[PDB]
A paper describes a structure:
Type IV pili (T4P) are functionally versatile filaments widespread in prokaryotes, composed of type IV pilins and assembled by conserved multiprotein machineries. We show that PilB is a modular pilin with a bulky module “grafted” onto a small pilin module, which directly mediates adhesion of S. sanguinis to host cells/proteins. PilB, one of the three minor pilins in S. sanguinis T4P, exhibits a canonical N-terminal class III signal peptide, the defining feature of type IV pilins. The larger size of PilB is due to the presence of a C-terminal domain readily detectable by bioinformatics, which belongs to the von Willebrand factor A–like domain superfamily (InterPro entry IPR036465).
To confirm that metal binding involves the MIDAS motif, we produced PilBD319A in which the key MIDAS residue Asp319 was changed into an Ala by site-directed mutagenesis. Binding assays performed with PilBD319A showed that changing this single residue abolishes the metal-binding ability of PilB for both Mg2+ and Mn2+. Next, to determine whether metal presence/absence might impact the 3D structure of PilB, we solved the structure of PilBD319A by X-ray crystallography. The PilBD319A protein readily crystallized in the same condition as the wild-type (WT) protein. We collected a complete dataset on crystals diffracting to a resolution of 3 Å and solved the structure of PilBD319A by molecular replacement. The structure of PilBD319A clearly shows that no metal is occupying the mutated MIDAS pocket on top of the central β-sheet, which is consistent with metal-binding assays. Although PilBD319A resolution is significantly lower than WT, it nevertheless allows for meaningful structural comparison. When the vWA modules were compared, we found that they are essentially identical, the Cα atoms superposing onto each other with an RMSD of merely 0.45 Å, including the two arms flanking the MIDAS pocket. This shows that metal binding by MIDAS has no detectable structural impact on PilB.
Residue numbers in the entry: 43 to 461
The structure:
């Protein structure tokens, strides 16, 4: 009657579900983060593992008093010297609950035809569940906590927004006043304020505002922590005087300003949210590029000024001079377009070292005004950081992407904080 050992492993899994249901956060670990005993065990995170030897399902708890783990035997009995194997997986989710699938199996010393409890399914009462297993692992241990992480590293966020003429029109590109619609800038103000409000919910996060047009401008150069009142930023955002559309689209300068402001801050989690609503058509060059017939001035003739051998302005000193500007008001010159994108590429390559991710949002109803958002995002990707491009064609879509960006920020915080 082998039903005894099978029922034993089932009782053990019942104990596991009982303990997991009470957890606020879950993390599936592997051979790296759990090789049995307290080896490599991370502070303040209780576990549930297969026991370094391999036959007693172990449960390590956090004493928090003696600052140590309290080894305990899962359930209360002990099997009859059987070879165990445990494996956890994230099997999707029910309505708003997430499902886990414990899989306990075992064989017996120097024999075959193992025995097992096929695969269970347990729904957790939380949503903060992640997996820290990789490429060829299984997930053999479980990490959790009862009370939330009692405060962790801070986050820095730079909002590089477009403030060009292409932002005064509709989303759908029609006229400003000829239609009863709100300009891209107005809707950006609304959605950005909503983002700011729901962003402070992360806690320990500070955001600054950078605006780019023909050149870049610091709307709020000081990184104000939302924990001390979000109203400090919202005001500057809704301030009717500043932040109005004017000029060509120069993303390189905006990236430079945002990345430098992020490099300054001490938060070990830096992010840049860039919003553009037009094809890139401008860039800034170094004073050196102002040599012989290197600057072709078709400004009054064909409406543009280009540089044959552009030496992009990548100096930490932020300044603007019309004489060092390359642009194409009609955004029809492929040379100026490619150079405007390469400018942001070099800027990201130099000022984007400790940046976690760069979110590029193309906010435009015109199907072609944001045709290079993906290209610009990929170019910025050369800096060696995570880059995500997204297109928002309506107010609802813009709010959806802003909310999703906040969600991803919280997931990176929870993941980085608490393994």
């Amino acid at each position: 009657r082998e039903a005894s050992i099978q029922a034993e492993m089932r009782t053990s899994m019942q104990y596991v579900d009982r303990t997991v249901g009470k957890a606020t956060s879950i993390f599936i670990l592997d051979d790296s983060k759990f090789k049995g005993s307290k080896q490599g065990l991370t502070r303040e995170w209780s576990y549930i593992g297969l026991s370094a030897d391999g036959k007693k399902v172990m449960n390590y708890v956090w004493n928090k008093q003696k600052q140590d783990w309290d080894v305990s035997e899962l359930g209360t009995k002990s099997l009859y010297n059987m070879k165990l194997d445990l494996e956890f997986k994230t099997e999707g989710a029910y309505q708003d609950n997430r499902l886990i699938s414990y899989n306990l199996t075992g064989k017996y010393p120097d024999t075959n035809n193992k025995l097992g409890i096929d695969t269970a399914i347990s729904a957790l009462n939380t949503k903060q569940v992640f997996s820290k297993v990789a490429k060829g692992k299984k997930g053999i241990a479980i990490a959790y906590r009862t009370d939330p992480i009692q405060g962790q590293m801070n986050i820095a966020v730079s909002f590089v927004f477009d403030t060009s003429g292409s932002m005064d029109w509709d989303l759908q590109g029609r006229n400003v006043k000829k239609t009863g619609n709100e300009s891209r800038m107005d809707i950006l103000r609304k959605k950005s304020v909503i983002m700011i409000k729901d962003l402070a919910e992360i806690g320990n996060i500070s955001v600054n505002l950078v605006g780019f047009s023909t050149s870049a401008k610091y709307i709020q150069q000081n990184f104000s922590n939302l924990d001390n009142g979000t109203n400090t930023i919202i005001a500057t955002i809704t301030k009717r005087e500043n932040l109005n559309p004017d000029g060509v689209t120069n993303p390189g300068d905006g990236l430079r300003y945002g990345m430098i402001s992020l490099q300054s801050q001490p938060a070990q989690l830096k992010y840049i949210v860039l919003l553009t609503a037009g094809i890139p058509n401008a860039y800034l060059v170094d004073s050196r590029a102002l040599y012989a017939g290197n600057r072709v001035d078709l400004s009054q003739g064909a409406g543009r000024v280009t540089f044959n051998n552009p030496i992009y302005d990548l100096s930490p000193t932020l300044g603007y001079e019309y004489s060092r500007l390359g642009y194409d008001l009609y955004s029809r010159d492929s040379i100026t377009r490619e150079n405007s994108i390469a400018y942001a590429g070099e800027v990201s390559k130099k000022f984007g070292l400790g940046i976690k991710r760069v979110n590029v949002i193309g906010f435009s109803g015109v199907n072609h005004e944001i045709a290079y958002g993906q290209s610009l995002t990929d170019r910025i990707g050369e800096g060696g950081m995570e880059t995500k491009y997204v297109s928002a064609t309506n107010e609802e879509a813009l709010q959806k992407t802003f909310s999703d960006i906040k969600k991803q920020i919280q997931q990176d915080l929870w993941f980085v904080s608490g393994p």
